[PDB]
JSON list of C-alpha atoms in Angstrom, two decimals:
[
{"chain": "W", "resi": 1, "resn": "UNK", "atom": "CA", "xyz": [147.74, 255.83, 103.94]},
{"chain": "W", "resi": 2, "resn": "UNK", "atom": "CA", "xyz": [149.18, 259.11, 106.14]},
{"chain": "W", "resi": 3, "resn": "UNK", "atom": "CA", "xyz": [149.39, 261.62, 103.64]},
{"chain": "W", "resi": 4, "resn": "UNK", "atom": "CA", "xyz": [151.18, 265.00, 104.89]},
{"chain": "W", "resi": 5, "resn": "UNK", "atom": "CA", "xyz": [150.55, 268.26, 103.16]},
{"chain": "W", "resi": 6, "resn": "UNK", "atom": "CA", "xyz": [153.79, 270.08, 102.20]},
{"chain": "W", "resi": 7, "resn": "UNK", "atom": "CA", "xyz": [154.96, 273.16, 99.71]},
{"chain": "W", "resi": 8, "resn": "UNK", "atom": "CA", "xyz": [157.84, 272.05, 97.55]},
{"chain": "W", "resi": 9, "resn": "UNK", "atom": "CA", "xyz": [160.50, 274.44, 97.70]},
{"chain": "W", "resi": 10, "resn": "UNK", "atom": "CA", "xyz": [163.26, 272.72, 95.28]},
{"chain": "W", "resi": 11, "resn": "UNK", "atom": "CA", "xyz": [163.44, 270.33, 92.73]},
{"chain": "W", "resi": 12, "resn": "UNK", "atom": "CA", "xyz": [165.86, 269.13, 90.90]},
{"chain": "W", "resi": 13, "resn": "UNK", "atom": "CA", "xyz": [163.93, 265.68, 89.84]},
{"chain": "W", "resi": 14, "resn": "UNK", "atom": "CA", "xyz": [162.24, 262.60, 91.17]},
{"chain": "W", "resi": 15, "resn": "UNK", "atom": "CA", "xyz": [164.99, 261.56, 93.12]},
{"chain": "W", "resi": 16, "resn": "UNK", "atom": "CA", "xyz": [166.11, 264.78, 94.60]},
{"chain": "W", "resi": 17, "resn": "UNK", "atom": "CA", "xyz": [163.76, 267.38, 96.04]},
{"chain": "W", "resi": 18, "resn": "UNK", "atom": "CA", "xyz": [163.27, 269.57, 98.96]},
{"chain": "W", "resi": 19, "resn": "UNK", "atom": "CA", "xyz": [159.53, 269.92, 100.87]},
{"chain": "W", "resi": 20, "resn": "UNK", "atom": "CA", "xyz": [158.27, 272.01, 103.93]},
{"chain": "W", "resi": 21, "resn": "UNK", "atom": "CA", "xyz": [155.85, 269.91, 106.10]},
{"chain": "W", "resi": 22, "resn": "UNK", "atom": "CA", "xyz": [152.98, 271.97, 106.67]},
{"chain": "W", "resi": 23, "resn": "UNK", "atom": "CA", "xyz": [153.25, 270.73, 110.02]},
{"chain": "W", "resi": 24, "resn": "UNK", "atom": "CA", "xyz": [157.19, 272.94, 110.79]},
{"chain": "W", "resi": 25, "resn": "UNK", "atom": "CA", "xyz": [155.70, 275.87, 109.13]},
{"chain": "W", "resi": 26, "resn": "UNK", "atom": "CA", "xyz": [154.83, 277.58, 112.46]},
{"chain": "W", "resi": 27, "resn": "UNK", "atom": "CA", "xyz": [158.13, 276.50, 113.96]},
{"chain": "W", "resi": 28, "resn": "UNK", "atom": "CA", "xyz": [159.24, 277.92, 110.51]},
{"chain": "W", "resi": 29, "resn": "UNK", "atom": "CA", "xyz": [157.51, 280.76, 110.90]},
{"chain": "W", "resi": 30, "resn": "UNK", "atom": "CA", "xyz": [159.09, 281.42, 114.09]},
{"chain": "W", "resi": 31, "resn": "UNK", "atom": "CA", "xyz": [162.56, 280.82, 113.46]},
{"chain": "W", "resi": 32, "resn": "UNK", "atom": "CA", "xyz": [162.26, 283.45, 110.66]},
{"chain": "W", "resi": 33, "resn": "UNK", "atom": "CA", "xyz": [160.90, 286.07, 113.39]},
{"chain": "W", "resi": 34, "resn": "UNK", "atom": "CA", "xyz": [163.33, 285.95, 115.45]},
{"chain": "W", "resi": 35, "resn": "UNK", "atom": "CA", "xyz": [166.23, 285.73, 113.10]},
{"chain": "W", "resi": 36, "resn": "UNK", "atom": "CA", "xyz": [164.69, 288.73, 111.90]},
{"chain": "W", "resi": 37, "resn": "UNK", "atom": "CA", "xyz": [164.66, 290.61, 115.06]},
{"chain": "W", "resi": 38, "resn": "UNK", "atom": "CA", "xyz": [168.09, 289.75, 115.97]},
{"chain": "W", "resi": 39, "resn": "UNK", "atom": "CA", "xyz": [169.71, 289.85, 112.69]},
{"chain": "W", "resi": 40, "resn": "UNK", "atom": "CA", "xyz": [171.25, 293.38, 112.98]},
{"chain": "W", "resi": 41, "resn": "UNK", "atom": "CA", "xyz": [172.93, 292.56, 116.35]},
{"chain": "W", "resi": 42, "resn": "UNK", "atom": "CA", "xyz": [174.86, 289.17, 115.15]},
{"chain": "W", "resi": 43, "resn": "UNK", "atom": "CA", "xyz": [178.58, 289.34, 115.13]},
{"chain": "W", "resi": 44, "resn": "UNK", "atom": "CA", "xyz": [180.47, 288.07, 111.94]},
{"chain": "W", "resi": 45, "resn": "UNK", "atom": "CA", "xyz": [181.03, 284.45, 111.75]},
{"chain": "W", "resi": 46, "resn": "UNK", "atom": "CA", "xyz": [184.85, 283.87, 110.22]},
{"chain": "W", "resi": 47, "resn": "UNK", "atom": "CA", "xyz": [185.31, 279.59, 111.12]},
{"chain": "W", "resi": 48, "resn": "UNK", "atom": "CA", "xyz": [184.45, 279.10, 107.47]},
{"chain": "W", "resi": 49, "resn": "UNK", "atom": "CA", "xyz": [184.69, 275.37, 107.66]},
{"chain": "W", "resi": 50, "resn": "UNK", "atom": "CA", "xyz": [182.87, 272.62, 105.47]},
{"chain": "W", "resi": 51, "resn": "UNK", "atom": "CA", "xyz": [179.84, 271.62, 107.88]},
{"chain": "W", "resi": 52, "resn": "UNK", "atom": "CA", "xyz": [179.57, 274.62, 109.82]},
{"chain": "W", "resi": 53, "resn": "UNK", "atom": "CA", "xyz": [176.14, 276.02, 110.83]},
{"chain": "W", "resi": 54, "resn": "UNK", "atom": "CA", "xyz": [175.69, 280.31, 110.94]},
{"chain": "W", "resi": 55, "resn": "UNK", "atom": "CA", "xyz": [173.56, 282.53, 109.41]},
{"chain": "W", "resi": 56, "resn": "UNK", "atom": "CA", "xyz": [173.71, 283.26, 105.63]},
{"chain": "W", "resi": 57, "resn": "UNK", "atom": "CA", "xyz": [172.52, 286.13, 103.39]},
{"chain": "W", "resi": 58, "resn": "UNK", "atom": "CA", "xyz": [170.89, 284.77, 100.07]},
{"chain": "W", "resi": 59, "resn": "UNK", "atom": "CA", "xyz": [172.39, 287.36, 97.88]},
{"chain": "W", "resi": 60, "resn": "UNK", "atom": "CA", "xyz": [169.67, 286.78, 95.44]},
{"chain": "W", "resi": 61, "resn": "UNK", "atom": "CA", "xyz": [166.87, 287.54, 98.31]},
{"chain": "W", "resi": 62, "resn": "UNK", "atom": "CA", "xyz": [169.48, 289.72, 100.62]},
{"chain": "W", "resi": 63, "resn": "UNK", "atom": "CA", "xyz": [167.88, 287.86, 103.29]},
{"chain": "W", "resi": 64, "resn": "UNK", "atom": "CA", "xyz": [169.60, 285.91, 106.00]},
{"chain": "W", "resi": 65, "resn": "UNK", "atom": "CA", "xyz": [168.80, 282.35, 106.90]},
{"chain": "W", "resi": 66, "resn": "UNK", "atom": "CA", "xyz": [170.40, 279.51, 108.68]},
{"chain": "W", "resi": 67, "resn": "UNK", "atom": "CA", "xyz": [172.79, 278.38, 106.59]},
{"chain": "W", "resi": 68, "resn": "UNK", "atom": "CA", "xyz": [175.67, 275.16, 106.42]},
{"chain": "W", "resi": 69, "resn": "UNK", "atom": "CA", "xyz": [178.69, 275.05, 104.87]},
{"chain": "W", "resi": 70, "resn": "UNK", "atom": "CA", "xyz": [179.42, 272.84, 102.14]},
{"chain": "W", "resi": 71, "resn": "UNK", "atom": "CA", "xyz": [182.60, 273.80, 100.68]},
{"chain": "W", "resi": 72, "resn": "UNK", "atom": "CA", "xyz": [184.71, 276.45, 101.26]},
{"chain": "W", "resi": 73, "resn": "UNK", "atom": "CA", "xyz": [186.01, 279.15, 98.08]},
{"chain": "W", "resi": 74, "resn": "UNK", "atom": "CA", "xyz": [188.35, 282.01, 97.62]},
{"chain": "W", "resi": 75, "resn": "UNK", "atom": "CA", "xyz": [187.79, 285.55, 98.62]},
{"chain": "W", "resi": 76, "resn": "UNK", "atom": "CA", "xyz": [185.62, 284.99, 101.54]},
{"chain": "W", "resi": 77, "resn": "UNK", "atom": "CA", "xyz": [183.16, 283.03, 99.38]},
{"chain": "W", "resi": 78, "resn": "UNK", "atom": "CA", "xyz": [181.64, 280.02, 100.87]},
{"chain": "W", "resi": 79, "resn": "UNK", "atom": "CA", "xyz": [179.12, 277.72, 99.20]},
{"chain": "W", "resi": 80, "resn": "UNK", "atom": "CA", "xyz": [176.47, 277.16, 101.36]},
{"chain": "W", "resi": 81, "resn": "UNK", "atom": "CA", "xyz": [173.17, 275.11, 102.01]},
{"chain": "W", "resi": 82, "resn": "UNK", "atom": "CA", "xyz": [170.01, 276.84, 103.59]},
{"chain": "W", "resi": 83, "resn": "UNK", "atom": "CA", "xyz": [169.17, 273.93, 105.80]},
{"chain": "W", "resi": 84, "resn": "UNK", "atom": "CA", "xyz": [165.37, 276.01, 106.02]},
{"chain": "W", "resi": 85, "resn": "UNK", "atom": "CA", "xyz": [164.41, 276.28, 102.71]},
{"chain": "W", "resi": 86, "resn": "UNK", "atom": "CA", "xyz": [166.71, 273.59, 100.92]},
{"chain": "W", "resi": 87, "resn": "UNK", "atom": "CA", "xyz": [168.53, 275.72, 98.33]},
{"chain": "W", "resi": 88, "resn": "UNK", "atom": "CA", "xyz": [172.16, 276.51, 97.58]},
{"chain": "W", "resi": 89, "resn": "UNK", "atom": "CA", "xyz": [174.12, 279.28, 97.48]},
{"chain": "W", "resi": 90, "resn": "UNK", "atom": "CA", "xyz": [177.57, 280.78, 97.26]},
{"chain": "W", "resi": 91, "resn": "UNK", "atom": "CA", "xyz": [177.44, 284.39, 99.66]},
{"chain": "W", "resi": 92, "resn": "UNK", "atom": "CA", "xyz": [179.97, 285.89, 101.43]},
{"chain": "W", "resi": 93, "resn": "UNK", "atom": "CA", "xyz": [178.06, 287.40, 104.43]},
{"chain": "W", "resi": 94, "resn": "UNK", "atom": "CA", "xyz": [178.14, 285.35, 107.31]},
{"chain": "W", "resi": 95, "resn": "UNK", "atom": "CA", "xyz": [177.10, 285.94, 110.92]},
{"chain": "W", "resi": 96, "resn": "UNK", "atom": "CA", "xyz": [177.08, 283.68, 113.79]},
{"chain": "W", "resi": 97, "resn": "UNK", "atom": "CA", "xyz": [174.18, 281.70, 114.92]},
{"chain": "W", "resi": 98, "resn": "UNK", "atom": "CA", "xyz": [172.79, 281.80, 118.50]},
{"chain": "W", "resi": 99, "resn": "UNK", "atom": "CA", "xyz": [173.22, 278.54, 120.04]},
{"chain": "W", "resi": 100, "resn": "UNK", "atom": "CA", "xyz": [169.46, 278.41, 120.99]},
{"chain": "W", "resi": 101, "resn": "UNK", "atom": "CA", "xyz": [168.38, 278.69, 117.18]},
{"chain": "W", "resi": 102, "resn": "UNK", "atom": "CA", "xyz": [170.86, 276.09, 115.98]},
{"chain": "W", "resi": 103, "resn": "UNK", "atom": "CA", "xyz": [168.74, 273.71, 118.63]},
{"chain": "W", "resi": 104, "resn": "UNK", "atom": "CA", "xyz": [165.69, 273.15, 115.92]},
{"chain": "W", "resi": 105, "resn": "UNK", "atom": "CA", "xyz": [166.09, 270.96, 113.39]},
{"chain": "W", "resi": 106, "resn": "UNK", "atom": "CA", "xyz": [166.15, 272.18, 109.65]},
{"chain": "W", "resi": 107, "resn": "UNK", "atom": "CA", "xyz": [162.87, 272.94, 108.33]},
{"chain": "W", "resi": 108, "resn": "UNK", "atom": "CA", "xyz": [163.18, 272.07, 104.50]},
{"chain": "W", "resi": 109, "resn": "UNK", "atom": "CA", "xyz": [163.34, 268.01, 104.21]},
{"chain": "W", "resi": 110, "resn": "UNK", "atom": "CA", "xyz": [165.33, 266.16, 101.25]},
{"chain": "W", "resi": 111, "resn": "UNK", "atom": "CA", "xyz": [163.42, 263.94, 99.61]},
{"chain": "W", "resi": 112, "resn": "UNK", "atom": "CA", "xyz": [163.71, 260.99, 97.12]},
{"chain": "W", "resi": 113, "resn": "UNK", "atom": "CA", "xyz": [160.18, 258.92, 95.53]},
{"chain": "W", "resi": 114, "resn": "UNK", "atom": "CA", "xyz": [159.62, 255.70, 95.58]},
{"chain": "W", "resi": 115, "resn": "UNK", "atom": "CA", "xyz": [160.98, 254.59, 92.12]},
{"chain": "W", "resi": 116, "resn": "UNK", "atom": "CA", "xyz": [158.01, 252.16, 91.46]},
{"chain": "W", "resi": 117, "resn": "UNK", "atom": "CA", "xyz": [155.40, 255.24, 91.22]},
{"chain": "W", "resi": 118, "resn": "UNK", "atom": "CA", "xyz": [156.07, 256.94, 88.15]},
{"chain": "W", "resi": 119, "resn": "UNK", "atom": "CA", "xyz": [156.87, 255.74, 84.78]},
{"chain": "W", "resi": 120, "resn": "UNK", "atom": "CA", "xyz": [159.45, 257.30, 82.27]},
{"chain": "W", "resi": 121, "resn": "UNK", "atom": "CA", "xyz": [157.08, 259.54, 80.80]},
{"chain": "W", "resi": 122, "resn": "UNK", "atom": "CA", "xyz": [155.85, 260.62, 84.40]},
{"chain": "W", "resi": 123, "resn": "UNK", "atom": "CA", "xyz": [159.57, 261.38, 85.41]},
{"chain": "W", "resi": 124, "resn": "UNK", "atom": "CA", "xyz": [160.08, 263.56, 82.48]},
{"chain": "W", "resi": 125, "resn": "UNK", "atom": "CA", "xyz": [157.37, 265.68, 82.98]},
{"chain": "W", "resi": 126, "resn": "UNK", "atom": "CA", "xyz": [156.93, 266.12, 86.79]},
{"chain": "W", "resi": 127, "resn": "UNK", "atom": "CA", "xyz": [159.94, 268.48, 85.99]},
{"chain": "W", "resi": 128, "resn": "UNK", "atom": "CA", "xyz": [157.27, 271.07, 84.01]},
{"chain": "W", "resi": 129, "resn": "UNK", "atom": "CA", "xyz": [154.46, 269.91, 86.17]},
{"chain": "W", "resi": 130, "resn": "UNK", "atom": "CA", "xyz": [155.83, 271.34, 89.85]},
{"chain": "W", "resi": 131, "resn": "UNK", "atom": "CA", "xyz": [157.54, 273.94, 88.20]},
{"chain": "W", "resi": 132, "resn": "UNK", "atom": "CA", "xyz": [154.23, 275.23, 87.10]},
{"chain": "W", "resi": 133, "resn": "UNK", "atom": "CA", "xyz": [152.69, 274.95, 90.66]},
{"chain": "W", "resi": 134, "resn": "UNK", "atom": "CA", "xyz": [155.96, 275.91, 93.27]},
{"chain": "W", "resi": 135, "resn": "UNK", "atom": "CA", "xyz": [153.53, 277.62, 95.40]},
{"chain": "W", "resi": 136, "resn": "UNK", "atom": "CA", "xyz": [150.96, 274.56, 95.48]},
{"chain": "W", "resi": 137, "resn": "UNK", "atom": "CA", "xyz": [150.25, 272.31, 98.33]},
{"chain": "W", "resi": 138, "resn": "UNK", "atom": "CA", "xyz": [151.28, 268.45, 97.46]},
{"chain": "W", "resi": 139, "resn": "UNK", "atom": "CA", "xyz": [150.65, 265.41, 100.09]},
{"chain": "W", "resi": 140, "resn": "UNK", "atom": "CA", "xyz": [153.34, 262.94, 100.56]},
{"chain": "W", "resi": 141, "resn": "UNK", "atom": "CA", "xyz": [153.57, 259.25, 102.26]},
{"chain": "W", "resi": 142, "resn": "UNK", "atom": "CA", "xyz": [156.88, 258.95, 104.07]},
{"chain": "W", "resi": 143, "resn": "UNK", "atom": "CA", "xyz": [157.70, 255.27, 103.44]},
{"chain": "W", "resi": 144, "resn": "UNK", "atom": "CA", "xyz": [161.21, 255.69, 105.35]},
{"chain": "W", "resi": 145, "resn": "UNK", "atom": "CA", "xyz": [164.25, 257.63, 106.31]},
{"chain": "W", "resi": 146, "resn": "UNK", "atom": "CA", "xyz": [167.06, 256.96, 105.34]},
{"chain": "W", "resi": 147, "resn": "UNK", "atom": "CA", "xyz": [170.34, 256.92, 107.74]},
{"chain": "W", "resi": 148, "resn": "UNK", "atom": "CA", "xyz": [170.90, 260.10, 105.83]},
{"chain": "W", "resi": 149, "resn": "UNK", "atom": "CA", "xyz": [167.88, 261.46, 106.70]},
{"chain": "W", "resi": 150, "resn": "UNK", "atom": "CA", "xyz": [166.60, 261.68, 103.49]},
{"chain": "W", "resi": 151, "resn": "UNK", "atom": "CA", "xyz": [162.46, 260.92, 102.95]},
{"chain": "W", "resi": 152, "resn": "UNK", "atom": "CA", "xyz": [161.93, 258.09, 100.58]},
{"chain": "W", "resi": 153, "resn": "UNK", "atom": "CA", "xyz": [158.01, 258.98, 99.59]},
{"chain": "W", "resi": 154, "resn": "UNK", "atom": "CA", "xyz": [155.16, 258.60, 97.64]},
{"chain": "W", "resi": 155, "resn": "UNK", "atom": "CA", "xyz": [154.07, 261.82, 96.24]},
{"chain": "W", "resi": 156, "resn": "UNK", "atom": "CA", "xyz": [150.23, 263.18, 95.71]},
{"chain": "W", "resi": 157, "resn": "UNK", "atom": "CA", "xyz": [148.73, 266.20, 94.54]},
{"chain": "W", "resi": 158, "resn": "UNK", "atom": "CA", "xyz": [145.19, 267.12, 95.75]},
{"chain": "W", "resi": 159, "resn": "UNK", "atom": "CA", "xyz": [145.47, 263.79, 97.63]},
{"chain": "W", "resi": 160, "resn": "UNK", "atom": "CA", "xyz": [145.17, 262.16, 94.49]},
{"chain": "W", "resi": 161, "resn": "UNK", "atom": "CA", "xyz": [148.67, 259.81, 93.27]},
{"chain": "W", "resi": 162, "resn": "UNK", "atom": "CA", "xyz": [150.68, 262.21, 91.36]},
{"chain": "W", "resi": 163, "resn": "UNK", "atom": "CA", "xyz": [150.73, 259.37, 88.16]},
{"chain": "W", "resi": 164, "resn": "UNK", "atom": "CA", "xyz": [147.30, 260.73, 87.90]},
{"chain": "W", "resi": 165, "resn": "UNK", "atom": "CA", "xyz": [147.22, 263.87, 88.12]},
{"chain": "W", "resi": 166, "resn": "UNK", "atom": "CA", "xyz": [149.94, 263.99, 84.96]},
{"chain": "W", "resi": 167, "resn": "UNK", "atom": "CA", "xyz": [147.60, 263.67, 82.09]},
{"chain": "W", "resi": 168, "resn": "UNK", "atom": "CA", "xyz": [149.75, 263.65, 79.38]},
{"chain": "W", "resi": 169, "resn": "UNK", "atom": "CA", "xyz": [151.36, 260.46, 80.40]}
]
C-alpha cells in the first residue's frame, strides 16, 4: 500500500498522536526560517480568544512557533496548541502572526490507528517502543480523514507493520 515516511513528534497512545510527513518538512523548514527572521519585529498579539492563531513562545524551548488558542487563563496565560509540531503549552508571550504565514496549513498531523492492527499487548507497549525512538523515521498508510481532520492510519516502522516490529508481544 502508500506508505509515507514521517517523524513522530507526540504521543500520547494509539489513538492519539502527532506525525510530520516527511513530505511538509521543507515547507516546515521554511516556515521556521522566516518566523525566525521576522520574529524580533512582530507586534504583541492581545485578542486572546479560544481558536485564535499568533505566534507562541514554548517557554520550555524559548522558541516561538505558530501557535492556537485553546483556552484562555488568568494573568495573561493562555493554553495553547503548536499547530507545527503538535504539542501543548501554557506561555504568556504572544505576538501576532503575518497573514501570509497563517496561509499554510499546520505542519504536525493528528493521528489515530486503525484499531484492528495491534493487539492489547501491542497497545501497551508501543508507549515504551516510540518513546525509545522519537527521533526515528516510521511509515504510515492514511486509510482516511476524518471531518476533523484527523488521520486514521496504519502504522510501520522500517516499512515493516509495527505488530512486528514489537517483539515482545
Amino acid at each position: 500500500a502508500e506508505l509515507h515516511n514521517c517523524v513522530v513528534v507526540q504521543f500520547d497512545g494509539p489513538m492519539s498522536f502527532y506525525v510530520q510527513m516527511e513530505s511538509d518538512v521543507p515547507a516546515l523548514e521554511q516556515m521556521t526560517d522566516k518566523l525566525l527572521d521576522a520574529e524580533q519585529d512582530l507586534p504583541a498579539f492581545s485578542d486572546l480568544k479560544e481558536g485564535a492563531l499568533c505566534v507562541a513562545q514554548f517557554p520550555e524551548d524559548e522558541v516561538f512557533y505558530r501557535a492556537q488558542i485553546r483556552k484562555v487563563l488568568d494573568d495573561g496565560k493562555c493554553e495553547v496548541h503548536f499547530i507545527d509540531f503538535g504539542n501543548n503549552a501554557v506561555t504568556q508571550q504572544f505576538r501576532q502572526l503575518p497573514e501570509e504565514l497563517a496561509k499554510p496549513a499546520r505542519y504536525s498531523r493528528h493521528c489515530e490507528l486503525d484499531a484492528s492492527t495491534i493487539s492489547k499487548c501491542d497497545a501497551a507497549l508501543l508507549q515504551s517502543f516510540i518513546d525509545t525512538r522519537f527521533s526515528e523515521t516510521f511509515q504510515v498508510e492514511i486509510l482516511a480523514t476524518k471531518g476533523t481532520g484527523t488521520h486514521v492510519v496504519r502504522l510501520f516502522y522500517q516499512s515493516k507493520n509495527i505488530s512486528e516490529k514489537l517483539q515482545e508481544c
